[PDB]
């Protein structure tokens, strides 16, 4: 091995660890947004029904 090679190893390993760290953050965000968005979807549909069911009133 040489110094030319190690500087790119180090460069590649730095960016890999930096992107992987971002992936953890993204995974946690995605887990929260997707579940809460699901519930906002259902809550909305339940609200639309009470609208239609109260002009039905």
């Amino acid at each position: 091995g040489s110094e030319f090679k190690e500087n790119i190893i180090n460069d590649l390993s730095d960016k890999l660890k930096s992107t992987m760290q971002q992936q953890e953050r993204d995974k946690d965000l995605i887990e929260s947004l997707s579940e809460d968005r699901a519930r906002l979807l259902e809550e909305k549909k339940k609200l639309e029904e009470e609208v239609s069911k109260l002009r039905s009133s």
């Binding site: 995974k27 995605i30 887990e31 997707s34 579940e35 699901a38 979807l41």
Partner: protein, 108 residues
């Protein structure tokens, strides 16, 4: 109105476990780079009701009239919980029309 056919759709998938979605573009659909595959809770009304989604990659070197087999990998963290609800894969075109709806499954 299945111009896209999902294949090998299990009746259940393990929660938070990497998954593969297999589907087939029939000659009747011209794929588009803004087509996508979503996981939808059963009973969806519109394309906004997706849970998560992934763009459907354009088949390489596409040929009009061809039947093209595809795979999308869904990471575990894209997937619904073990919640007792049923889900399906859906193929949504760039115009927003659903052109493929798989058999339902549960995450469990």
């Amino acid at each position: 109105f299945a111009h896209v056919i999902f294949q090998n759709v299990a009746k259940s998938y393990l929660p938070n476990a990497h998954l593969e979605c297999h589907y087939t573009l029939t000659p009747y659909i011209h794929p588009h780079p803004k087509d996508w595959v979503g996981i939808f809770k059963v009973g969806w009304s519109t394309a906004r009701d997706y849970y998560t989604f992934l763009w459907s990659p354009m088949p390489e070197h596409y040929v009009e009239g061809s039947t093209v087999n595809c795979v999308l990998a869904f990471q575990g963290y894209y997937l619904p919980n073990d919640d007792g609800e049923f889900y399906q894969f859906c193929y949504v075109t760039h115009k927003g029309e659903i052109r493929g709806a798989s058999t339902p499954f549960q995450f469990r």
